[model samples]
Structures are given as C-alpha cells and as structure tokens.
Target chain A: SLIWGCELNEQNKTFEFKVEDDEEKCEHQLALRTVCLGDKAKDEFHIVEIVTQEEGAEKSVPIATLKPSILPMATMVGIELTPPVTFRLKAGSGPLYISGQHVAMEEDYS
Target chain B: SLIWGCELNEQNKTFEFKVEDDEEKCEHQLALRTVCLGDKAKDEFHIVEIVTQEEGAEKSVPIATLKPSILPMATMVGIELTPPVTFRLKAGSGPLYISGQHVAMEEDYS
Candidate 1:
C-alpha cells in the first residue's frame, strides 16, 4: 500500500529509482502508473530511454524508449515488476517524473 | 475522480476513447495513467501510435509513438488533457490497454 514517485533533479537532470531486495520470495510487485515532464523540460530532448537493473544482475538493460513531447508532457503507462529493480532515465536535461504504487501479496488482503 | 480503462477489441483490433465537451467550459481535464499489453497481444506488433481528435476539430493528430515489448508489457505514464478528445491506437492486433483518471475543476473540491 505504498505510493512512490521519482523525478530527475531538475538542475542536474539525473535520477535513480530502486526497489530493494528482500530475503523473502519475489511475490510482491510494483505498479508503475505515471510518466510526466515538468515545466522546465527542454523541448529538444524528445527521446527518453528507461534503464533497468535486474535483481542480482550485473548488467543494466535498456527497458523502454519513449517519444514524449513538451505540450502533452504527461501520459499513463503500466508496468508491474518484481522487487530488487532499478530504474533510470537518461534524458539529458529534461525533468521527467515517474510515479507508481507498491503492490502487496494476496495474503495481505486476507 | 473517475477511473477509466479502455482496450482494443481483441478479435477486431480496434478501439476508441473519447471525452465529450459540454456548454460549460474547458476547465476540466483527464489524467492518463497506464499503457499496457494484455496476454493475447502479438509480438510482431512492436510499434503503437495514439491518434487524438481535438475539441470540435476536423483533423486528427498523431499524439505519440510507443515502442513497447511483450516481456515488459505494462508501464506508467501521465497525460492531462482537456475535454473533447479522442484516442485510438493503430496497432494491428495487440491487446493494448490504456487507463486514466478524469480531473474536475478546482471549484468542485469546495
């Protein structure tokens, strides 16, 4: 029942979002729901790439590529991922924001 | 605060999401939050485009281009658009799902 949001440090244009690994099984998940660009995001940086680091994996993978614009700077997407994950957006100087929620296992509901 | 979700008719591979305009004004908006592919989606259909119709306009605009994967099907996005809009995905047969929330004017909160 946790909601989380991450954004590039406007001035720095770099950011990282990581879900820590736990000893327990990988039953829990995270539902990513929002991707937005702030007012300061430059119009030139139209392409954005999402980088992901898998659990216990050494190499980082390029997850998805987004062609977002300055006018309609915000849109909705869905990604349900297991824990021990890392996310980063290499958008140069653009201020991109990503938001999501942590999903608990079925046992929590019972 | 209305939550909405739309998906392509898997058998037909066509869908539409539209917001109608009223006589009042254009103060209202919609927050799009999710973009995903269901289990039945085809792997070859890698590219997806969102086409939008403006309020009381004749031309339809190509809003965004998404390059999504089957393995990582679901992801989040953020889009706040005003009323009188239409969204259609030109993917051939991918069961693409898009979800969002409708936002009202500030006066409603009071």
Candidate 2:
C-alpha cells in the first residue's frame, strides 16, 4: 500500500535501556511506519505501536499515545517517539509506508 | 489550485492573553498555516508567525516555534495550541485555511 525506507523484520526489532540520566538517553531502534489519512477531519496525531520491546523495567508499557492539534487539514497516521523517552532505534520496525486508498500515484512519481 | 474559506488579513489577526494561570485560559487569535511536506520526513509540527498582535507583554514574545515529530508521513504544516495552553477563540481569523498543494482533491470529496 505504501513505500517504506526500512522493512519490519520482527526478529530484528529491538531497543535497550541506557542510563537513567536524560543525556545518557539511548534510543530504541525501530522501523517507522507512516501514513497520510484521506479524511483530514478524522485524522489524529496519535501514537500507534507495531512492535514493542523493552527490558528491565518495573512498569507497564504503552504502545502509543495521541495528541490532537486543532486545525483543519489532512491528517497523519503513524507512530514516532523521541527522547527523554524512546531513546534508541531498533531494526525491522514497519510495514514501512502504509496507505489507505487515498494515497495517489502522483506521490510515487515524486 | 485550492480553496480557502478564510483569507489572510493582517488587520484581523489578534490574540489576547488572560491570567497567568493555565486555566481560566484564553486562546490567542490566529489563522494557522499547515502543510504536508513532500520530503519524507522533512515535515515538522512547528509553529509559524503570520499576523501576531500581542498586548501587555513585559517580555519579548515568540510568534512561532517548531517541534519535530519523527516517523515521517510527508510532514504536517500548521499551528495548534491546546490547553493548559491555548484556551479561547475570537473573531476575524482568516486566510482561515492554507494549502501548499500537497493535499489531494480526493480529500475534498470525503
């Protein structure tokens, strides 16, 4: 349905916990999946998780979260996390690029 | 190539600041500019300053700022501030909509 820079190989997906200090923050390697939803009004700046790997933690984890900004435009559909949190990047993280019927052929030409 | 119900009139854009408290909040008036970047991932969830008229400023102010969200679905171009931050609304905000041509017509039919 879409194009992806990297492929999601579940076996290769991984992340590591570095030091607790923010500077020492390590990123969890992930293959990012992004999509452009045709229904702009219905779109959400939310977080979705396709693969999750965590180690040595004493807490429950969330796959993703969403924050909505009030504006009228098309919407984005995908997941991206950064540090002071998801610090490291891992392998095999995506369907890569996801598209509903809305994505057009013109995008491919670009 | 596109349509916008609101026009960008510099005189119509104004934002009022209420109490210092987060609640009892008031939102500044703005005509947001949002775009979907063709560059994968060159997009940003950033703030832009077009028509900003502020009152009672003891300190220098910020018209716009940018925050990058990783994952890359082209990119989002707009300004949306929510509470415990932006709180209210006012009149005469225009060029109410903006498009860079990245948004597709199929979006309109839906």
Candidate 3:
C-alpha cells in the first residue's frame, strides 16, 4: 500500500512516487482514492491534476484533476496512478492532500 | 464507470450498489476510489464503512473506513469494493459521496 501524501503550491508543483517492490511489482496497482483540501474562504477553488510515466516513456500522460470548492472540500478519483506517478497542482495555492492504497489484483471471475 | 452518490442519515443508514455489466463481467474489477464528505462544522466527525457481498453468500465482508475530520474532510481508500457493494454510515449522518471506476484486468508484465 502507498499513500503519496502531497501538498502543492507555487513553490512545489509536481510530485512523483514509485513503489519499489519486487514481489508485487506488476501484480498490483497503485489506486488513488481521494483529494482533500485545506483551509479556504467561501467560493475559493483548488485544482490538482495527476499524471504517470513509465520507465522508458518519453512523455507523461494526464490522468485526472481534482477540483474542490468550499462546501465539499474533497473529491474521489478511484484511479490507477501506477507507481512512478506524479501529482501536479494545476491551479490554486493548495495544501491539498491526496491518499490511496496499493491493491493486489487477482485472476478471478465475478 | 460508476458513481454511488448517496446521502445517509437517521432515516437512511446503509446504501448498496451493483454494476450490471454484461460484456465486462468477470473480466474487470470494481475499484472504489474516493470518499468525499458534504457539510460539517469544526471538530465534527463523519465515519463511513464499506462492505461487499457475493451472490449466495451469507455474510458480507468489511472493506475500509473513511474517517475525515474538519480540517481535511476527505479520505482516500484506493480499494476495490467489487459489485454488489454497500456503504454504511456507521457513526455520523452524512451526505457522503463515493465514486470509482470499473477497471479491466489484462495479462502482461509491467
């Protein structure tokens, strides 16, 4: 399990994480679950985006963005931001926090 | 792709969801990505737990719990709450929101 807890702002923009596991490297996935925001006034906006790149890949791909407002300061993105991933704060100065888990996948049928 | 948006309270306590997919049945997993809370005051607490049940099963299994406080009112549980899932507001009454995706499983080495 991996929790890439990050806070983004003008100074710190992008974040990258890699699960250095040998036993469960490719058998599991890094699942991103929630985007929780810090203090903000009414109607204030905070946006953060996620991206991931492979070992030999030249470019990184955009996964999704978390745009949360005042009333509901968190959004869920149950996505696979596979290890060696990054979180980019696209807009707003945020102490935005992100969390997730590493789930081991199996070959079973429903 | 599914979003089980539910508001739990004294009247409504538990919520259940099922992804009736035909083509992708058994070939993919239902991934529970995020738990976003609604309105809350300082120090207020909202606790929600997830469970899943398979067909012809007598009991359901507990997945994970999201306990988000006032400062950061959302938690990420990058977990897999497969089809026929249930959301139970164990403690606080919430207009809690949960979202995730149905990801396909492939054969390869990452």
Candidate 4:
C-alpha cells in the first residue's frame, strides 16, 4: 500500500537523513518526507516525521511535530521568500499524538 | 529511517485507500500522509501523490500531483470551511517527476 507521496525538491528528497539528539549518542536515523504543491503561490503542503521502526525493523515510523518552516500565515497571492526549514525526529514512544489525537500506533506500520 | 510526518484528521488516515481508475481493474491502493500546523490560520502545508511500488514490491512509491483542496488564497487568517480532497495513484513508469524534476527513482526506496 502507498503510505504517502511527496513532490521532491533540493531541500526535500527521498530517504534523506539529518541526525539529531547528539549524533554521537544516538544511532537512530531520522529521515524526512515532504511534498510541495507545484503552484508556489498557494504554499500549501504536507510533511511527515519518520524514524526507524526499531534496531532492525524493515519499516519506518511516521511521527509528527512542528518544524520551523511550518507556520500560520495570512492568505496572500504572490511569491514569498523561501526559508530554510530543518526537521529532526523527536525521540519517544506509544501512540503518536497530534492535535490531541492519537494518529499512529507504535509498531503498527511494521 | 523516517520518511514523512503527518498531522492526521478524520479526512486523512494512515493506510487509508481510495481506489481509482476502475477499482475492479486497477487493484492498486493509494494512501495519503498529511500534517497541518496547530495554527490553522496559516493554511501552509505539503501533500504527496503516492502509489504502490509494484507487485511484490516492499516499499511504496512517493509520487506527485495537485489535489482539489490545494489552492492559492489571499491573506486572511481565520477558520474556513474545509473542502474534501480525493486522490488516487496514477498508473505509469520511469523516474517520478514533479516540477519537471525527477523526484523519485522507480526502485530506489525498495
């Protein structure tokens, strides 16, 4: 089953990783998946926070969080400055919650 | 590794499928991953068009497209009526392209 889709860009690519939480201490690989609408004026999109399912898990975990680039803005029809948004997977466990809703269950995707 | 993150809602759920192109013929499952910032006014977001990699393929393919809900709006920060957006996996081949750039190689993620 297709879990998600992303329009790739220089900043967002498939299976790209940026380690967080002190790379020397954590071996976990945090990867990013994002897709932007072709029409830039809208600036509408989706982003996912994923992590390795486990030490040797075949599937990865899709989690959530607020990244710098994600923000509330008034509607405007024009080109805007592109800001660099960096994301890191927050380490944790249990049912993944977003907006007080339990969205993902641990190990469910695996 | 983590591939994407989504702030799910009643509309979008993990592994949810809406078969397109004549369900009896295609048999392909299209899924969606989406995340919305807690602050609704901005309406800034990302969306991806994805499809099953192939028969017996282990990983899903992340593709691209513009959905109905995606649009360009002028600046106005307020809660708005949510519109329904339906998506499906468009059957095809070759490196996936978005904005004239190949975003996903057919088998890299697998």
Best by lDDT: 3
Per-residue alpha-carbon lDDT of model 3 for A3-23, expressed as tens digits? 445666556667766666872
Residue B52 deviation, candidate 1, in Å? Answer: 3.4
Write candidate 2's Cα lDDT for B18-98 as tens digits.
Answer: 223432233322222332211112234423233232474322234333333542222334543321222111322222222
Q: What is the DockQ score of candidate 1, to 2 decimals?
A: 0.03
Two-chain complex of model 3, DockQ on C-alpha atoms against the true structure: 0.03
Q: Estimate, for each residue in B1-110, the C-alpha lDDT of model 3 and write its tens digit.
A: 32233444445568766666762654666665444444331234555666654486634444333333333234346576556666676666555555555556665556
Give one digit per residue, the lDDT tens place, for model 4 in B1-110: 11322332223322333223443242232222322222232233333333234335633332232222443222112111111222232321212112111112233443
Q: If scored against the real structure, what TM-score would every candidate get?
A: 0.39, 0.19, 0.43, 0.20
Superposed by TM-score, candidate 4 places the C-alpha of residue A6 at a distance from the truth, in angstroms, of 14
1 or 4, which is superior by DockQ? 4
Kindly give the stretch of ten consecutive residues in candidate 2 chain A with the minimal lDDT sum.
A96-105
Scored against the true structure, residue B22 in model 2 reaches a CA lDDT of 32
Provide the lDDT at B44 for model 1. Answer: 52
What is the TM-score of candidate 2? 0.19
C-alpha lDDT values of all predictions = 0.51, 0.27, 0.52, 0.27
lDDT of 4 by residue, A15-106 (tens): 33332344324223222232223333222333334333446563433333222234322112221111122222233221111111101223
- CAPRI-style class, candidate 2: incorrect
i-RMSD of all predictions: 11.4, 15.9, 9.6, 8.7
Expressed as tens digits, the lDDT of each residue in A38-90 for candidate 1 is 56666543233343432334333333223343232444445565555555544
